[PDB]
Paper text:
We have recently turned our attention to a new class of controller proteins (exemplified by C.Csp231I) that have quite novel features, including a much larger DNA-binding site with an 18 bp (∼60 Å) spacer between the two palindromic DNA-binding sequences and a very different recognition sequence from the canonical GACT/AGTC.
The C.Csp231I–21-mer DNA duplex complexes crystallized in three crystal forms. We note here that the intermolecular interactions observed between the two complexes in the asymmetric unit of the C2 crystal form may be of biological significance (this is further elaborated in §4.4). We note that three of these interacting residues (Glu83, Lys87 and Asn90) are located in helix 7 at the C-terminus of the protein.
Author numbering:
A (entry chain A), B (entry chain B): 1 to 94
The structure:
DNA sequence: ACACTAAGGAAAACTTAGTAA
DNA sequence: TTACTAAGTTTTCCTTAGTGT
């Protein structure tokens, strides 16, 4: 998991490391420590948790694993497109 | 990491679980076991190994971590674009 | 060649109990 | 409050050594 994507998504959201964990379902006791470990690259969360974090952060989970700056932006933006906007890009791909 | 995504990518590369591990840097002696365990979802590779696996499979590492089928395709398809075709999309998104 | 699995040491994540701006 | 960390504990993985096609 890319620590910097985790930091940018959390900052845009406006919540602490501890808050993020609790909402993401991590136990109050270890929430603060764990969320800091992931954000400092000391440990990696597992994919389940990653999804849970993504859900709180209102981003697609794969943004967290996207190194390509240009692609990460596309994902972040695809996420917010409305019904027509996406239907446009779909015909585009196929 | 989504095992189904790993499997589909490998099959399109037209290579064995083993060869994949070998080319991805896993030692010959364990490459088969490991790559199978990943593909059956017994254990998940760490991100570094994911990245290695992706370079060999000629795909963006996000693909392995994207549960949405329509976003996965977008990622896969963006991958096939040239430097200019990508400037064309990056401006649409800025 | 190719897909696959149990077991147990190797290694990584999780928990606790904190400190530091 | 929020960020951060070491050390202990528990969990998951990598390697070995086989299975079967």
């Amino acid at each position: 998991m890319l620590i910097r994507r985790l930091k940018d998504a959390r900052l845009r959201a406006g919540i602490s490391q501890e808050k993020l964990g609790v909402l993401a379902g991590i136990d109050e006791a270890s929430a603060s420590a764990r969320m800091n470990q992931y954000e400092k690259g000391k440990h990696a969360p597992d994919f389940e948790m990653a999804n849970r974090l993504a859900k709180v952060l209102k981003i697609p989970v794969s943004y967290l694993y996207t190194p390509e700056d240009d692609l990460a932006q596309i994902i972040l933006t695809w996420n917010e497109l409305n019904e027509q906007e996406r239907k446009r890009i779909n015909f585009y791909i196929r």
